[PDB]
Amino acid sequence: MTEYKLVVVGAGGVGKSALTIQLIQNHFVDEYDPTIEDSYRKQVVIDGETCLLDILDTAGQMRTGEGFLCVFAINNTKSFEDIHQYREQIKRVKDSDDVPMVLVGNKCDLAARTVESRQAQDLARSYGIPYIETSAKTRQGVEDAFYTLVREIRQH
Ligand SMILES: Nc1nc2c(ncn2[C@@H]2O[C@H](COP(=O)(O)OP(=O)(O)NP(=O)(O)O)[C@@H](O)[C@H]2O)c(=O)[nH]1
Ligand SMILES: O[C@H]1CO[C@H]2OCC[C@H]21
Ligand SMILES: O[C@H]1CO[C@H]2OCC[C@H]21
Ligand SMILES: O[C@H]1CO[C@H]2OCC[C@H]21
Ligand SMILES: O[C@H]1CO[C@H]2OCC[C@H]21
Ligand SMILES: O[C@H]1CO[C@H]2OCC[C@H]21
Ligand SMILES: O[C@H]1CO[C@H]2OCC[C@H]21
Ligand SMILES: O[C@H]1CO[C@H]2OCC[C@H]21
Ligand SMILES: O[C@H]1CO[C@H]2OCC[C@H]21
Ligand SMILES: O[C@H]1CO[C@H]2OCC[C@H]21
Ligand SMILES: O[C@H]1CO[C@H]2OCC[C@H]21
Ligand SMILES: O[C@H]1CO[C@H]2OCC[C@H]21
Ligand SMILES: O[C@H]1CO[C@H]2OCC[C@H]21
Ligand SMILES: O[C@H]1CO[C@H]2OCC[C@H]21
Ligand SMILES: [Ca+2]
Ligand SMILES: [Ca+2]
Ligand SMILES: [Ca+2]
Ligand SMILES: [Mg+2]
């Protein structure tokens, strides 16, 4: 019935699971339980089409994915620097450079920012992908991030 397999990747603790839970269940996960591999399904209407989102939430501590959210946290410079390695791993497993992706800078509700918006925009630009900032806590940008990924998949 038209399904999209979205894979969420990124360093430990950047908020992959909190983002996913906010999207699917509309509440914020405050505690930190490291993930191994969890998947969720949700039926939603995106741009006039009823579809099934299968979201694969991965460990920060891929073969089946149609699009990838590459997540870092804006108060976590190491997680941003790690993005290069995550994208390379994705391309290694997919054996292609033509993989739908969105770059996500999470935790934008926090003030200890060490990754400036412009730096992330430039990274995304070099990859030919959108950059979207999010807060799993406030829900800001969460729908933008996941729905923009769906819209990118539809372009490939
Ligand atoms: N302030 C704030 N805290 C957040 C945000 N997203 C996640 N967190 C917090 O960061 C911690 C880790 O979140 P989590 O979703 O488990 O991260 P993860 O990327 O899934 N970790 P792992 O790779 O180990 O599974 C939790 O305490 C969570 O509440 C956010 O947008 N804002
Ligand atoms: O997971 C949270 C708590 O610990 C920090 O480490 C990086 C991610 C942050
Ligand atoms: O809330 C938005 C973002 O997530 C979707 O799930 C159902 C409603 C949609
Ligand atoms: O307490 C941690 C876990 O949840 C976030 O909310 C703001 C502070 C962060
Ligand atoms: O302890 C820190 C790191 O992990 C979060 O969980 C809730 C409190 C936050
Ligand atoms: O139980 C606490 C201490 O260990 C972590 O693992 C998952 C839940 C967290
Ligand atoms: O793994 C997801 C689903 O359960 C939440 O609790 C902690 C991590 C979150
Ligand atoms: O949360 C951590 C600690 O225990 C493992 O079980 C599944 C998730 C892993
Ligand atoms: O199956 C759908 C409906 O409820 C949500 O919780 C996790 C998966 C989502
Ligand atoms: O190795 C890290 C980076 O990608 C995820 O896939 C499974 C384990 C996670
Ligand atoms: O800094 C290392 C240890 O914590 C992880 O979070 C993102 C960066 C990773
Ligand atoms: O394994 C990760 C870290 O190093 C990159 O090399 C290709 C796969 C990527
Ligand atoms: O999760 C609790 C603790 O922090 C607040 O932020 C929004 C939800 C509230
Ligand atoms: O802050 C969130 C909510 O709205 C979007 O605009 C830019 C960042 C995203
Ligand atoms: Ca909560
Ligand atoms: Ca390969
Ligand atoms: Ca929106
Ligand atoms: Mg997780």
From Swiss-Prot:
Judging by the UniProt lineage, the source's domain of life is Eukaryota
Tell me the protein's name.
GTPase HRas
Q: How is it modified after translation?
A: Palmitoylated by the ZDHHC9-GOLGA7 complex. A continuous cycle of de- and re-palmitoylation regulates rapid exchange between plasma membrane and Golgi.
Q: What does this protein do?
A: Involved in the activation of Ras protein signal transduction. Ras proteins bind GDP/GTP and possess intrinsic GTPase activity.
What disease involvement is noted? Costello syndrome: A rare condition characterized by prenatally increased growth, postnatal growth deficiency, intellectual disability, distinctive facial appearance, cardiovascular abnormalities (typically pulmonic stenosis, hypertrophic cardiomyopathy and/or atrial tachycardia), tumor predisposition, skin and musculoskeletal abnormalities.
For whether the record's keyword set contains Ion transport, the answer is: no
Task: Identify its membrane topology class.
Answer: Lipid-anchor
- Provide the glycosylation site positions: T35
Q: Which Pfam families match?
A: Ras
Q: What is the effect of changing D38N?
A: No effect on interaction with PLCE1
The reported effect of A59T is: Loss of GTPase activity and creation of an autophosphorylation site
Write down the SMART domains for this protein, in alphabetical order.
Answer: RAB, RAS, RHO
Placement of sequence motif Effector region = 32-40
EC code: 3.6.5.2
Q: Where in the cell is it found?
A: Cell membrane; Golgi apparatus; Golgi apparatus membrane
What the entry lists under NCBIfam families is as follows: small_GTP
Tell me what gene encodes this.
HRAS
Q: Which residues carry this modification: S-nitrosocysteine?
A: C108
- Catalyzes what? GTP + H2O = GDP + phosphate + H(+)
**In which tissues or organs does this protein occur?**
Widely expressed.
Stored CDD domains: H_N_K_Ras_like
What is the uppermost EC class here?
hydrolase
The UniProt activity regulation field reads: Alternates between an inactive form bound to GDP and an active form bound to GTP. Activated by a guanine nucleotide-exchange factor (GEF) and inactivated by a GTPase-activating protein (GAP).
Documented effect of changing G12V: In CSTLO, bladder carcinoma and CMEMS; constitutively activated; interacts and recruits PLCE1 to plasma membrane
User: What's the subunit arrangement here?
Assistant: In its GTP-bound form interacts with PLCE1. Interacts with TBC1D10C. Interacts with RGL3. Interacts with HSPD1. Found in a complex with at least BRAF, HRAS, MAP2K1, MAPK3 and RGS14. Interacts (active GTP-bound form) with RGS14 (via RBD 1 domain). Forms a signaling complex with RASGRP1 and DGKZ. Interacts with RASSF5. Interacts with PDE6D. Interacts with IKZF3. Interacts with RACK1. Interacts with PIK3CG; the interaction is required for membrane recruitment and beta-gamma G protein dimer-dependent activation of the PI3K gamma complex PIK3CG:PIK3R6. Interacts with RAPGEF2.
Q: Which GO terms describe its cellular component?
A: ciliary basal body; cytoplasm; cytosol; endoplasmic reticulum membrane; glutamatergic synapse; Golgi apparatus; Golgi membrane; GTPase complex
